[PDB]
PDB file of C-alpha atoms and ligand atoms in Angstrom:
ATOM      1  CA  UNK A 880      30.224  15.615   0.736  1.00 27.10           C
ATOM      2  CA  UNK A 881      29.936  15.111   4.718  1.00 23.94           C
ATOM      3  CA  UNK A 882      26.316  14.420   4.043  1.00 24.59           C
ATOM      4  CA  UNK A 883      25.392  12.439   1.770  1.00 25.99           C
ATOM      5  CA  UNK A 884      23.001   9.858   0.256  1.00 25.59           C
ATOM      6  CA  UNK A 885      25.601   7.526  -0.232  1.00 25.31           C
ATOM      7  CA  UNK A 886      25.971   7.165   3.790  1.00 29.26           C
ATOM      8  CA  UNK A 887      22.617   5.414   4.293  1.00 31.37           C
ATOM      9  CA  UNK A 888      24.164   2.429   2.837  1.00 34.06           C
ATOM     10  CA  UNK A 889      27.540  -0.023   3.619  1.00 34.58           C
ATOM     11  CA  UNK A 890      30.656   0.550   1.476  1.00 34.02           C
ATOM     12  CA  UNK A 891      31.140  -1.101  -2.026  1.00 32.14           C
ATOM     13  CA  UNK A 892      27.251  -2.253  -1.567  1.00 33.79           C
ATOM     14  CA  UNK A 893      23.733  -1.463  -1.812  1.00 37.67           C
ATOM     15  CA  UNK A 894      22.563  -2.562   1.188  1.00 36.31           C
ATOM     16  CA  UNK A 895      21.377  -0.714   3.848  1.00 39.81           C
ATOM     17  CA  UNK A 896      23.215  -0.283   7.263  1.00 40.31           C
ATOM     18  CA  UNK A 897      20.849  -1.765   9.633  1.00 42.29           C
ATOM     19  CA  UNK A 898      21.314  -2.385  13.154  1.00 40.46           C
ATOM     20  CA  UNK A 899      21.492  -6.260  12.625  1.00 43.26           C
ATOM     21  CA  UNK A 900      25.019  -5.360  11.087  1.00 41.44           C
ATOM     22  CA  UNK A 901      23.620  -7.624   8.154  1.00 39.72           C
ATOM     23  CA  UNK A 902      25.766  -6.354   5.003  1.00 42.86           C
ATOM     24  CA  UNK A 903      24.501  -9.325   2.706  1.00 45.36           C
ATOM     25  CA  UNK A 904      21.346  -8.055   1.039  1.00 43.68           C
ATOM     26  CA  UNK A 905      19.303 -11.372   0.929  1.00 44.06           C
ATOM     27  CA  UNK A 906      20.270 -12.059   4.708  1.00 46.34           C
ATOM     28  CA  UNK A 907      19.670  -8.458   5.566  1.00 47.74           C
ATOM     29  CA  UNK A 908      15.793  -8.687   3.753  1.00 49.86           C
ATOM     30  CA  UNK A 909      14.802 -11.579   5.606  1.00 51.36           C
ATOM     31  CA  UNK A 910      15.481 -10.284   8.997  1.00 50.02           C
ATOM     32  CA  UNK A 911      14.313  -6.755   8.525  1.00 50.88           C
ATOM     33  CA  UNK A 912      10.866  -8.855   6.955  1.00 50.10           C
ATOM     34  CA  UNK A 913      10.897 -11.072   9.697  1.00 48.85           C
ATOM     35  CA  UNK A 914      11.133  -8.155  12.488  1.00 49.68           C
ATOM     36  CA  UNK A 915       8.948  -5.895  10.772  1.00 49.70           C
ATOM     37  CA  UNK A 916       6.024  -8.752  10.736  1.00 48.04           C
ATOM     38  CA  UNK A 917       6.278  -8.926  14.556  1.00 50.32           C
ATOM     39  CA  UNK A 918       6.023  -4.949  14.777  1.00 53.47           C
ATOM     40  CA  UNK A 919       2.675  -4.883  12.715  1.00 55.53           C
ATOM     41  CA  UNK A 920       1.113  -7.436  14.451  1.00 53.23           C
ATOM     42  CA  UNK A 921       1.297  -5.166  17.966  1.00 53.53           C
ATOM     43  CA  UNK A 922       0.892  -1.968  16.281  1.00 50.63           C
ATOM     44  CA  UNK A 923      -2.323  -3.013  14.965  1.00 49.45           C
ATOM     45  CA  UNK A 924      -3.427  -3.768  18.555  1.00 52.72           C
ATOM     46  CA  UNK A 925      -2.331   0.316  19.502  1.00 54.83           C
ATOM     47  CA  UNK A 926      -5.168   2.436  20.123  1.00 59.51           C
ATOM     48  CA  UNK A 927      -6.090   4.614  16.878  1.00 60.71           C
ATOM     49  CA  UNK A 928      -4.433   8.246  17.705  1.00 57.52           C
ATOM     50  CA  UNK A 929      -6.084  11.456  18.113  1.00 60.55           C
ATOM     51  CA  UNK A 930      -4.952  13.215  15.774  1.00 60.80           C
ATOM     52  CA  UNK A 931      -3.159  11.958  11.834  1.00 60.96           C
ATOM     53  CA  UNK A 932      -0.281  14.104  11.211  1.00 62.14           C
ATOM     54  CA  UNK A 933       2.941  13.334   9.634  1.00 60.28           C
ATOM     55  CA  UNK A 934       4.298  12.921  14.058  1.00 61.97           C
ATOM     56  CA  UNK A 935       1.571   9.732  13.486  1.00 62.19           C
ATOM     57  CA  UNK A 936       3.338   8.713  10.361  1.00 59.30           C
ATOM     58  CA  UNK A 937       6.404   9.062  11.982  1.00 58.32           C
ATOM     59  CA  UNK A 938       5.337   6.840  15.158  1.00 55.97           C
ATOM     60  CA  UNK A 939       4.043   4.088  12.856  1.00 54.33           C
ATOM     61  CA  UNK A 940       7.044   3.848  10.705  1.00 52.90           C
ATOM     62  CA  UNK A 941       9.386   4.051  14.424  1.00 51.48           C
ATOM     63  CA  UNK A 942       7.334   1.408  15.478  1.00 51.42           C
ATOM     64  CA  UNK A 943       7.983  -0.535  12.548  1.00 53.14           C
ATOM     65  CA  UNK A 944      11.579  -0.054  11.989  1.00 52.48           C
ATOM     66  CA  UNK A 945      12.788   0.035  15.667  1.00 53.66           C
ATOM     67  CA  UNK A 946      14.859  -2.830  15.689  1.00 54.99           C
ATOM     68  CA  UNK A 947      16.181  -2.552  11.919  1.00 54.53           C
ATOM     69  CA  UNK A 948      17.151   1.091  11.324  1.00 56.94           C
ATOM     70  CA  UNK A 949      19.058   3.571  13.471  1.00 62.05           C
ATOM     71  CA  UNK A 950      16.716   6.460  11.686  1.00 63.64           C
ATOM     72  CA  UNK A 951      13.314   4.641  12.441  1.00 64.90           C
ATOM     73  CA  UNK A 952      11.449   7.369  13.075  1.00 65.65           C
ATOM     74  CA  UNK A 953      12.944   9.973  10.391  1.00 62.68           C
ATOM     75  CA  UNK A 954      12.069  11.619   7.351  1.00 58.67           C
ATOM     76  CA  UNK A 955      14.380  11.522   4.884  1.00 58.94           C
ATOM     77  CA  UNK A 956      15.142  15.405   4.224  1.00 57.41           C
ATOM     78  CA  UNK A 957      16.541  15.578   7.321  1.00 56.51           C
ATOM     79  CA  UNK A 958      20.310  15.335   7.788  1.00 55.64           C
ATOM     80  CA  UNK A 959      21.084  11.899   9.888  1.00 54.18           C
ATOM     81  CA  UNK A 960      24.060  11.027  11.774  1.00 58.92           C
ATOM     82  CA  UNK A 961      24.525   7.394  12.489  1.00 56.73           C
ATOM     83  CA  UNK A 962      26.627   5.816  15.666  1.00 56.69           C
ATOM     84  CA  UNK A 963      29.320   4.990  13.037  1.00 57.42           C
ATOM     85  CA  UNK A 964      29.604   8.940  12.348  1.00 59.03           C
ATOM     86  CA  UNK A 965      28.880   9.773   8.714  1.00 61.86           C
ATOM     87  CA  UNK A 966      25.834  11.918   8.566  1.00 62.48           C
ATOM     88  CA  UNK A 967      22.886  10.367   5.746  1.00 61.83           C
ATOM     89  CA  UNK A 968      19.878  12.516   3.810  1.00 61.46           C
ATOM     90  CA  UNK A 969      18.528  12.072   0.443  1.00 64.54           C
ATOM     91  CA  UNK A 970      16.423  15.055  -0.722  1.00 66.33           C
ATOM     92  CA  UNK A 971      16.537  13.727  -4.482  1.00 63.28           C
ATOM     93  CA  UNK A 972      16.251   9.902  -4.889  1.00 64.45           C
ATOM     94  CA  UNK A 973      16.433  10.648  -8.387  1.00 65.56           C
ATOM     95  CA  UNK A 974      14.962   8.464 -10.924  1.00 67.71           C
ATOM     96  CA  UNK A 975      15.865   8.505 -15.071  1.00 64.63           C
ATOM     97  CA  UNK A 976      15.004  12.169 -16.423  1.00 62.37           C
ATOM     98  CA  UNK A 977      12.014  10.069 -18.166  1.00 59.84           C
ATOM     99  CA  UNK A 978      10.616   8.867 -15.048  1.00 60.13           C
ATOM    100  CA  UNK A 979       7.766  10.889 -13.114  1.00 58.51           C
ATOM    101  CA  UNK A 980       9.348  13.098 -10.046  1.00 62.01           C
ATOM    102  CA  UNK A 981       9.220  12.429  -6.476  1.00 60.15           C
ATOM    103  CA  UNK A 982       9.386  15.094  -4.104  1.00 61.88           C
ATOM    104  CA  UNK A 983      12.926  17.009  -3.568  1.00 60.72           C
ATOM    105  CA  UNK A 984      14.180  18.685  -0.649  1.00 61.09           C
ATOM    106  CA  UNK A 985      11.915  21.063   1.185  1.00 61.35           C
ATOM    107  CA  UNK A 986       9.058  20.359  -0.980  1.00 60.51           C
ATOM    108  CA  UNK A 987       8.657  17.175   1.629  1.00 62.13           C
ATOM    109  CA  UNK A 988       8.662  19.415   4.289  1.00 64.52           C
ATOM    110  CA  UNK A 989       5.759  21.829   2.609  1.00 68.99           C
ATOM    111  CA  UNK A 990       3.732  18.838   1.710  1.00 67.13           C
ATOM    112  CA  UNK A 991       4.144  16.857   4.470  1.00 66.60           C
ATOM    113  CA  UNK A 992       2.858  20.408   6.429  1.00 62.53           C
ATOM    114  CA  UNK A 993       0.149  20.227   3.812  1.00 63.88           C
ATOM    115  CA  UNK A 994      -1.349  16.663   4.840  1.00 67.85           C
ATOM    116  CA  UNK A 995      -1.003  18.148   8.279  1.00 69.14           C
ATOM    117  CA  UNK A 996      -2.790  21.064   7.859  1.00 71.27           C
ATOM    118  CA  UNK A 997      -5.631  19.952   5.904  1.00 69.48           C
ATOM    119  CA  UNK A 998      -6.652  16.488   8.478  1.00 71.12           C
ATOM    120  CA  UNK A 999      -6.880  19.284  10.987  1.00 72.32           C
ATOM    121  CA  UNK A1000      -9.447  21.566   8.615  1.00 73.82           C
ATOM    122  CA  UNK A1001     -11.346  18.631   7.949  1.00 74.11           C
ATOM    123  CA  UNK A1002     -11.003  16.780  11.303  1.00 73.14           C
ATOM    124  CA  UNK A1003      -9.410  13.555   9.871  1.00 73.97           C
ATOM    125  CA  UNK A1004     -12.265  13.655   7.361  1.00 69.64           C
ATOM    126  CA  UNK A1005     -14.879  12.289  10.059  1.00 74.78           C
ATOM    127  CA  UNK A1006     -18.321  13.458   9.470  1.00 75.04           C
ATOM    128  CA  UNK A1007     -18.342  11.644   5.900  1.00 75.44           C
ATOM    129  CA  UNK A1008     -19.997   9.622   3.679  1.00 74.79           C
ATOM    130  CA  UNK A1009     -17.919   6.503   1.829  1.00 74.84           C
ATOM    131  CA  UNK A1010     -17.792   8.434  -1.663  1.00 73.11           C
ATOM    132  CA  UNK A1011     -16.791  11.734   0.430  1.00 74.55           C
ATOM    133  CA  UNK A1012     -14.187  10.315   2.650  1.00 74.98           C
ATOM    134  CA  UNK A1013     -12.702   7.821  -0.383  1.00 71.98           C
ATOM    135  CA  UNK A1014     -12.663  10.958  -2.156  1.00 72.44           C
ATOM    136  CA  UNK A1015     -10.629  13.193  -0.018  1.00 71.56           C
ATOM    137  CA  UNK A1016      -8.636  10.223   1.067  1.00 71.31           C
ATOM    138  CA  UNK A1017      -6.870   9.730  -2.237  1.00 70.47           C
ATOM    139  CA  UNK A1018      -5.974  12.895  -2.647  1.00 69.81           C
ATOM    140  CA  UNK A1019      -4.040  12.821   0.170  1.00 68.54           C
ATOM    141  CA  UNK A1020      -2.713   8.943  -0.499  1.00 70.98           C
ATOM    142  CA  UNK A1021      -1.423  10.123  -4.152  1.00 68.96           C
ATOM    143  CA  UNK A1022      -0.070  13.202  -2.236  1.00 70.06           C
ATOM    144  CA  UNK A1023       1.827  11.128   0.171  1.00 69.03           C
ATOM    145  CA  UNK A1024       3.019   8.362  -2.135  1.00 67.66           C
ATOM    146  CA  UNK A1025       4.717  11.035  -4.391  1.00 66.05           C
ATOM    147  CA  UNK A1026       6.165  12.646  -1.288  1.00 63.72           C
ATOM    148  CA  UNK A1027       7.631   9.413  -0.259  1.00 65.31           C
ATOM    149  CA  UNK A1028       8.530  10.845   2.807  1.00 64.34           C
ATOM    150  CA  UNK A1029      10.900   8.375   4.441  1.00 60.18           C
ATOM    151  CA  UNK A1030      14.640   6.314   3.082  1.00 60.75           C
ATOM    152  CA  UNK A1031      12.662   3.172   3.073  1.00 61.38           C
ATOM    153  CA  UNK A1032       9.719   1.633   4.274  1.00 61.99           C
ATOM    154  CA  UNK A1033       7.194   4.279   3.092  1.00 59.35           C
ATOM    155  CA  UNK A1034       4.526   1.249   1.499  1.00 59.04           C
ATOM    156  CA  UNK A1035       3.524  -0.414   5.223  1.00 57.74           C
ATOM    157  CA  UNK A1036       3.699   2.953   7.132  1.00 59.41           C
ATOM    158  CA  UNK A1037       1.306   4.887   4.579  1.00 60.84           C
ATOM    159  CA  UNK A1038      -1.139   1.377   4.345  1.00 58.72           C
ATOM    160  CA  UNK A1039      -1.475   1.349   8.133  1.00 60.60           C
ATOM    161  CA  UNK A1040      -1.758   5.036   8.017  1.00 62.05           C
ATOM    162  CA  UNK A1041      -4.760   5.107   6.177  1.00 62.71           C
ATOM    163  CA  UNK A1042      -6.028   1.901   7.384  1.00 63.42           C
ATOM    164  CA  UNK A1043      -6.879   3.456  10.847  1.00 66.69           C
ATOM    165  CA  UNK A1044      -7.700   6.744   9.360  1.00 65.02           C
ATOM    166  CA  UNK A1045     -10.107   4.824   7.556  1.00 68.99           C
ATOM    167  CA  UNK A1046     -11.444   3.194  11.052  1.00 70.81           C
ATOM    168  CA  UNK A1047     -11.513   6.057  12.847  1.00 72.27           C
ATOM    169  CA  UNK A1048     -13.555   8.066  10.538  1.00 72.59           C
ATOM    170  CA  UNK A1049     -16.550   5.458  10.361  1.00 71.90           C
ATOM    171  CA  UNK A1050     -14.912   3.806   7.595  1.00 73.10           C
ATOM    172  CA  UNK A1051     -12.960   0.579   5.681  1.00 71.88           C
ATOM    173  CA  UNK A1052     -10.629   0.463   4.008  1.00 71.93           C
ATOM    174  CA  UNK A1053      -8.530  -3.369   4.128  1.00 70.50           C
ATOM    175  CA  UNK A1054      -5.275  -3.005   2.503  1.00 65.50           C
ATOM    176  CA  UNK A1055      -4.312  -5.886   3.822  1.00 66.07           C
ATOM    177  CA  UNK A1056      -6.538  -7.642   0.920  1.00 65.32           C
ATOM    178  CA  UNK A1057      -4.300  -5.681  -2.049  1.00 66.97           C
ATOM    179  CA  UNK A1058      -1.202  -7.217  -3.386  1.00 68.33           C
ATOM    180  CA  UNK A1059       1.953  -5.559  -3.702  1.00 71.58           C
ATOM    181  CA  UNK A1060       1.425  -5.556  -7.885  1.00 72.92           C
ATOM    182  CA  UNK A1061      -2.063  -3.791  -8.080  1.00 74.57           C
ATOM    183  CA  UNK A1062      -0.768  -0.703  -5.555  1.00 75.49           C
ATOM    184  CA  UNK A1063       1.914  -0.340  -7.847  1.00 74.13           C
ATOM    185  CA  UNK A1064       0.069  -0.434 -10.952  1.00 74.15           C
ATOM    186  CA  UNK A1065      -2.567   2.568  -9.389  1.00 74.80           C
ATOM    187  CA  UNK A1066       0.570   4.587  -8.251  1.00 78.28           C
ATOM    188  CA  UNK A1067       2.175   4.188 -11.863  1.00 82.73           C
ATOM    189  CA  UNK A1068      -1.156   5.226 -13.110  1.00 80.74           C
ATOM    190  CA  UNK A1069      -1.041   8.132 -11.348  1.00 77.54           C
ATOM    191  CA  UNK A1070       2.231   9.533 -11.812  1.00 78.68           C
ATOM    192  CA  UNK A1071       2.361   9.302 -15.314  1.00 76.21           C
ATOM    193  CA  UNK A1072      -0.937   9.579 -16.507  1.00 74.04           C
ATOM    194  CA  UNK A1073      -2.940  11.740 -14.013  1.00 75.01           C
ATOM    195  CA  UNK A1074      -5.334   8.926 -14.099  1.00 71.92           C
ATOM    196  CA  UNK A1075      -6.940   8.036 -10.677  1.00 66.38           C
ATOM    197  CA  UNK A1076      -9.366   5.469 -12.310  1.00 63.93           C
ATOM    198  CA  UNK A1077      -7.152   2.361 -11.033  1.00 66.08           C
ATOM    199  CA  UNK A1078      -6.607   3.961  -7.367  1.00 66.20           C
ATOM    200  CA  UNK A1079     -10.282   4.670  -7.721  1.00 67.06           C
ATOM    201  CA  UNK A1080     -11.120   1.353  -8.247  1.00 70.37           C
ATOM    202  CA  UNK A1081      -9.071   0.116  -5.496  1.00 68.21           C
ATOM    203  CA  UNK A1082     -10.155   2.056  -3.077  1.00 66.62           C
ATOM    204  CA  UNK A1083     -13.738   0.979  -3.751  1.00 72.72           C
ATOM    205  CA  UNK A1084     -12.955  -2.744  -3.493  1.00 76.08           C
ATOM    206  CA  UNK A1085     -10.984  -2.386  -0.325  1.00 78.63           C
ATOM    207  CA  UNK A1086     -14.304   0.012   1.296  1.00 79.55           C
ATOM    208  CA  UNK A1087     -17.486  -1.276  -0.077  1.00 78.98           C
ATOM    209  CA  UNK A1088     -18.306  -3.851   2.095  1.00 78.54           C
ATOM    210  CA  UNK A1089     -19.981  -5.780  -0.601  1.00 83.62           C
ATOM    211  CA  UNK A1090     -16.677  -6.310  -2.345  1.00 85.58           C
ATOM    212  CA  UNK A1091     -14.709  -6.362   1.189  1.00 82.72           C
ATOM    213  CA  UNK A1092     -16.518  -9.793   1.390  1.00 84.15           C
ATOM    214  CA  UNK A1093     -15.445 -11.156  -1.999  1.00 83.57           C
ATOM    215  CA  UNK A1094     -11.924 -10.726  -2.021  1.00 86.67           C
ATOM    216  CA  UNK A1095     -11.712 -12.401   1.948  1.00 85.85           C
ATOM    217  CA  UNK A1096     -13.223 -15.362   0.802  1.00 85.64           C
ATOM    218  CA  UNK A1097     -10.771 -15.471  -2.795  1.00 87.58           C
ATOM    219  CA  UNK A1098      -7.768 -14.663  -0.347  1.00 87.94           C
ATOM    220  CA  UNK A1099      -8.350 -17.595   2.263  1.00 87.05           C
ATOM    221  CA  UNK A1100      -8.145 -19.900  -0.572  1.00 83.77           C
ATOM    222  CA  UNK A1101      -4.580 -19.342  -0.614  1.00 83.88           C
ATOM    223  CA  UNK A1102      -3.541 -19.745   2.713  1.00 81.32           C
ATOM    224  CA  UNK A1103      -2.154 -23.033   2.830  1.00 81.99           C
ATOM    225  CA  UNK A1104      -1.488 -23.654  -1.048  1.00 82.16           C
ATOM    226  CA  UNK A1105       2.467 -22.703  -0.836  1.00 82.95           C
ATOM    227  CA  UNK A1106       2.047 -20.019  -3.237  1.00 84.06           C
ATOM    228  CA  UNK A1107       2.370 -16.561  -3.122  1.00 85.43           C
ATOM    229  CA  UNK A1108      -0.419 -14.262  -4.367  1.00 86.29           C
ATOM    230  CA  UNK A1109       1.519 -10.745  -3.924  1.00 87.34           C
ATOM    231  CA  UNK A1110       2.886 -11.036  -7.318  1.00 87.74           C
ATOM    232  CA  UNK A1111      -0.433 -11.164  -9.014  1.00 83.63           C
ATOM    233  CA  UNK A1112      -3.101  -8.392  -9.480  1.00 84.44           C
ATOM    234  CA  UNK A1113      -6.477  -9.263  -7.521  1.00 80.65           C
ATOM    235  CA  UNK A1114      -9.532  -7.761  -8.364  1.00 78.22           C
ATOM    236  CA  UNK A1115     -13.347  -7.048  -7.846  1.00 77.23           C
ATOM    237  CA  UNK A1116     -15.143  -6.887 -11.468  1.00 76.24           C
ATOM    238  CA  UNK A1117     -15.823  -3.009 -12.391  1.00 78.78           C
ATOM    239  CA  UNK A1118     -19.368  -2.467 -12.826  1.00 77.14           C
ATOM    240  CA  UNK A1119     -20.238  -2.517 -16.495  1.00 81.16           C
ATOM    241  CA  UNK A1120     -17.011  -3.408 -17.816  1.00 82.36           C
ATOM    242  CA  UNK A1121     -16.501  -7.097 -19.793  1.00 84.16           C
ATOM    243  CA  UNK A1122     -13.420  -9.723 -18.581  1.00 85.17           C
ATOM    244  CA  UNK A1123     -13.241 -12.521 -20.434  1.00 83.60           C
ATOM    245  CA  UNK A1124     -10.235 -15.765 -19.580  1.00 78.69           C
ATOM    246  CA  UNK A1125     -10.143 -19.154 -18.159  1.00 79.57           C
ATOM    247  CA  UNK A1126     -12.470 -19.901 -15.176  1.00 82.84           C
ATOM    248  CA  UNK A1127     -11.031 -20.828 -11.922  1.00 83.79           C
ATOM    249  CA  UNK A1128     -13.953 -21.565  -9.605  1.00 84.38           C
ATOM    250  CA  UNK A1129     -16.673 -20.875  -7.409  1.00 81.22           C
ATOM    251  CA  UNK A1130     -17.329 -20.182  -3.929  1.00 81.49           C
ATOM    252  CA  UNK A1131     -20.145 -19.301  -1.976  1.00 81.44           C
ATOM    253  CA  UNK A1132     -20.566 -15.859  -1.864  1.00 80.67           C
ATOM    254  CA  UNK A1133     -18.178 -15.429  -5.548  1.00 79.53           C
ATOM    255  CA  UNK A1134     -15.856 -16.913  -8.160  1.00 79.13           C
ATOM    256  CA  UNK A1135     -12.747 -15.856  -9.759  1.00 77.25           C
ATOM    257  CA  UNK A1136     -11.179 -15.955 -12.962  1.00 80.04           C
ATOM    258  CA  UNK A1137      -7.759 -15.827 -14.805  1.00 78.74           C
ATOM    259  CA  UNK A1138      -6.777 -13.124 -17.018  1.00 77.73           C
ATOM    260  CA  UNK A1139      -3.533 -12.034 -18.444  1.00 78.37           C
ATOM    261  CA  UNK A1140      -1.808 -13.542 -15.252  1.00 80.15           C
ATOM    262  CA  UNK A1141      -4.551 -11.346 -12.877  1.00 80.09           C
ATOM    263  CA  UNK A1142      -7.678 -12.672 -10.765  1.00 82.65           C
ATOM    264  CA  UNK A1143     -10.747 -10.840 -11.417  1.00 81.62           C
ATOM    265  CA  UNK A1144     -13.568 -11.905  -8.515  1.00 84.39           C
ATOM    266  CA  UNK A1145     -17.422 -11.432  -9.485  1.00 82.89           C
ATOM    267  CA  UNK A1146     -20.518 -12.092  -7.368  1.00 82.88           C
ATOM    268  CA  UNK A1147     -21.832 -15.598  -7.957  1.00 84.14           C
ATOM    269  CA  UNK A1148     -25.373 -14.210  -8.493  1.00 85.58           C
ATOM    270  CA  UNK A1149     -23.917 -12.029 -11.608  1.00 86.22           C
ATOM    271  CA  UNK A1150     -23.710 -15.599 -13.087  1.00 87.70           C
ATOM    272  CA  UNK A1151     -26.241 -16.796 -15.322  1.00 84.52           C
ATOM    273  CA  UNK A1152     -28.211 -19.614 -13.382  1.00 83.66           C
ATOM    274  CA  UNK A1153     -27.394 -21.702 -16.157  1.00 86.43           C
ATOM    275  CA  UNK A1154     -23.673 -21.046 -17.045  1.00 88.03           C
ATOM    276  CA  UNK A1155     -22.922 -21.868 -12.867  1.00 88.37           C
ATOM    277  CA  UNK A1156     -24.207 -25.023 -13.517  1.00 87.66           C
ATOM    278  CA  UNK A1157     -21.892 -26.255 -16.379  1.00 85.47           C
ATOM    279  CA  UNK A1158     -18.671 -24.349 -15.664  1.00 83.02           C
ATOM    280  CA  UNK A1159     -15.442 -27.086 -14.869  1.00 83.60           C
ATOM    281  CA  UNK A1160     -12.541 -25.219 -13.813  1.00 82.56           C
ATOM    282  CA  UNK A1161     -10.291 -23.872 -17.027  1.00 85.03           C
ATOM    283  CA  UNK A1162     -13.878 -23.192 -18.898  1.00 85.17           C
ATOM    284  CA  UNK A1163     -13.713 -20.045 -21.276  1.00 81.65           C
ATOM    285  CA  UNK A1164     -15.955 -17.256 -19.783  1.00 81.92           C
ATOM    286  CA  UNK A1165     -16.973 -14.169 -20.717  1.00 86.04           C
ATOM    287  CA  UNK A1166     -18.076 -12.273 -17.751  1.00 85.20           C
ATOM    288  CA  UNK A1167     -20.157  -8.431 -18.044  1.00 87.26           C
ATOM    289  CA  UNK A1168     -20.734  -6.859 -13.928  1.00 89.39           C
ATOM    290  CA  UNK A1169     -24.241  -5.653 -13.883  1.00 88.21           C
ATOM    291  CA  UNK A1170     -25.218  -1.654 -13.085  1.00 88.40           C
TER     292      UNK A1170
HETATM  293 CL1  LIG B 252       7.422  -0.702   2.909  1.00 91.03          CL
HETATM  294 NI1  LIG B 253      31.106   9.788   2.120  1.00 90.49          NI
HETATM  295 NI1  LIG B 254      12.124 -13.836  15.725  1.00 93.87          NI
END
C-alpha cells in the first residue's frame, strides 16, 4: 500500500533509513549510538519542563534522534512521508500470535491522551511520598512501555522521561544504574504475567537512596575493566529473600555476589562480623537481607 510499514526501512534490508544514508546495519548502529550519546549528554543539562505530556516525550526523543532519523520527533501511528517520498506508519508491529500485544492503531493515540490526562489530575504526581509516587509511576511506565509509542528508540526516551519526572517531583529514580537485561526481564514480567513484583523491585533500588548508594559504588568498579555490564542483571538483595553463589567481593559501603550469571549487591553490615573476615573471592555464600 502507499503507506506502509515496510517504508521505514531500505529495500531488500532491515535497516532503517537514517539520515547518515548508512544502509549496512552494523555501520548504521554505531553511528546512530555514537550520535545519540552526544544528544543525552546535553539533554540532561535542559531545564526539567513544566509540564510531562506525551509533546515532552516527543521533545526528548527529537532531541535524541535529530541527527539520525527524518521522523525524530514522531509517533509512530502517524502516517510519515520521508524526503525520498514513500509515506511510513506502523500501527501493528506485530509480534507471534503467542506473544503479549502492544498497542495498535488509535489505541496509542487514547493512551498516550491517557498519560496526558492523568499527570495533569495529579500534577506530575508532586505532592508525594516515595511509596506514593513509585506507585503511580509504574503504572504509567508499564502503560507507556506497552504503548511503545514511537518506530524506534522508545527505551532512552521513556528512561529520561521518568528520570526527570522523578526529579521534579522531589524524587530519584537513576536508571542510569539498570542494565539493559533487568528492564527487560520486569517488562517481560509484566506483559505476560501481570506481575509487577520485578518492576517493583527495580524501582525501589533505583529510588531508595540506601540502595541508590550500593549499586554506584558496584557500578564504578567496572569502569575501566573492558567489560561490559549491560548484558548482566544487577541487583540490590530483596529484603527477606535468600541468594546463595560464588562471592565476588567487598567494598566499603557493600559486596556483591555471582548468581546464575546475575550480581546481587548486599549491605556489608548484613554480613556476619565473622563470615567478612574469612571470605576470599569465589567463596560459597549463602546470603538472607534482614527486615
Ligand atoms: Cl532506545
Ligand atoms: Ni511500498
Ligand atoms: Ni562524533
Amino acid at each position: 500500500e502507499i503507506i506502509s510499514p515496510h517504508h521505514y526501512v531500505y529495500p531488500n534490508t532491515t535497516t532503517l533509513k537514517n539520515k547518515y544514508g548508512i544502509k549496512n546495519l552494523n555501520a548504521f548502529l554505531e553511528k546512530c549510538s555514537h550520535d545519540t550519546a552526544k544528544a543525552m549528554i546535553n539533554l540532561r543539562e535542559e531545564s526539567l519542563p513544566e509540564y510531562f505530556d506525551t509533546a515532552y516525550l516527543c521533545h526528548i526523543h527529537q532531541q535524541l534522534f535529530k541527527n539520525t532519523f527524518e521522523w525524530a520527533g514522531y509517533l509512530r501511528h502517524i502516517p510519515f512521508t520521508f524526503a525520498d517520498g514513500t509515506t511510513a506508519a506502523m500501527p501493528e508491529m506485530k509480534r507471534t500470535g503467542w506473544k503479549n500485544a502492544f498497542a495498535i492503531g488509535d489505541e496509542i493515540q487514547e493512551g498516550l491522551q491517557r498519560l496526558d490526562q492523568t499527570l495533569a489530575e495529579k500534577n506530575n504526581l508532586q505532592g508525594l511520598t516515595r511509596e506514593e509516587f513509585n506507585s503511580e509511576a509504574i503504572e504509567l511506565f508499564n502503560s507507556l512501555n506497552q504503548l511503545h509509542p514511537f518506530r524506534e528508540g522508545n527505551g532512552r526516551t521513556q528512561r529520561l522521561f521518568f528520570e526527570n519526572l522523578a526529579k521534579a517531583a522531589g524524587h530519584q529514580l537513576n536508571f542510569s544504574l539498570i542494565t539493559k537485561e533487568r528492564m527487560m526481564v520486569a517488562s517481560v514480567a509484566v506483559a505476560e504475567n501481570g506481575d509487577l513484583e520485578p518492576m517493583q523491585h527495580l524501582f525501589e533500588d533505583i529510588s531508595n537512596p540506601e540502595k541508590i548508594r550500593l549499586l554506584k559504588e558496584f557500578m564504578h568498579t567496572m569502569k575501566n575493566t573492558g567489560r561490559n555490564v549491560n548484558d548482566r542483571p544487577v541487583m540490590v538483595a530483596k529484603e527477606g529473600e535468600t541468594y546463595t553463589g560464588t562471592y565476588r567481593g567487598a567494598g566499603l559501603e557493600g559486596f556483591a555476589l555471582n548468581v546464575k550469571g546475575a550480581y546481587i549487591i548486599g549491605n556489608i553490615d548484613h554480613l556476619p562480623p565473622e563470615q567478612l573476615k574469612i571470605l576470599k573471592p569465589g567463596d560459597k555464600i549463602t546470603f538472607t537481607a534482614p527486615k
